[PDB]
């Protein structure tokens, strides 16, 4: 295991990826905490932290260029609030294979204004009742959830559902 250090960043692969974006590969190091990302000097469109040991998505510095965060196969159970102040242009967050449990644990993501793609595959939250409906309602800008589109009819249905008294009670208990 190693910690996320400037030395690690400097030795790691930094390259143009198959979708033509600048990517930093930090995969497989069992990194236990996000830190020292300021040392990237905002060079990257995408940071790949797959296969580490993160328990929290937190401690991001100002990185206006960052658009994709790959977080596959960590142990994440908590997301810190206000991360949109650090990475306001985040477009995709891939949290496949983590430990996010409840819909309320996703509330810290609501502030992202251009977050269009989320994966919560192989997290307990993605099998909770009303998951897709709640995501459509709570994240109106979201386009792709677990690699299935949120369609226009899906948007409308979710909005109409949560307008009803029964829908409002569902929301109340989700909190």
């Amino acid at each position: 295991m190693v910690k996320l250090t400037p030395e690690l960043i400097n030795q790691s692969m930094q390259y143009i990826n198959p979708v033509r974006e600048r990517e930093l590969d930090l995969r497989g190091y069992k990194i236990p905490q996000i830190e020292n990302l300021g040392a990237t000097l905002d060079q990257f469109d995408t940071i790949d932290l797959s296969d580490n040991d993160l328990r929290k998505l937190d401690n991001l510095p100002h990185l206006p260029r960052l658009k994709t965060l790959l977080l596959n196969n960590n142990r994440i159970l908590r997301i810190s609030e206000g991360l949109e102040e650090a990475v306001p242009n985040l477009g995709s967050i891939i949290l496949t294979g983590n430990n996010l449990q409840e819909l309320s644990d996703l509330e810290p993501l609501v502030g992202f204004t251009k977050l269009e793609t989320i994966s919560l595959l192989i997290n307990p939250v993605s099998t909770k009742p009303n998951y897709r409906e709640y995501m459509a309602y709570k994240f109106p800008q979201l386009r792709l959830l677990d690699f299935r589109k949120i369609k226009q009819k899906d948007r409308q249905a979710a909005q109409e559902f949560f307008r009803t008294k029964q829908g409002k009670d569902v929301l109340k208990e989700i909190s």
Binding site: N17, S50, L144, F147, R148
Partner: protein, 92 residues
Amino acid sequence: LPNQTIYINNLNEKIKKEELKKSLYAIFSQFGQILDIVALKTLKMRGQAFVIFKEIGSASNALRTMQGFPFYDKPMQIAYSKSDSDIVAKIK
């Protein structure tokens, strides 16, 4: 016959190829480093893609795990690529 490249069929042709590639990268990134993705708007590659992993073991895990996954509402049909010459013939 396992090799580093998976071949996918039954992909949703209504999805723009740039978006398709970005989403394929995201969903397959859990298995390993991806060296390239091939998904062209041609008849020969209609509804199809190749995802090239750095490691064969990653390709094997991706094939086993994602078989039949409903990607853009269609179950993926995944196999190992037949040969590098087949890949070349497909993109020509």
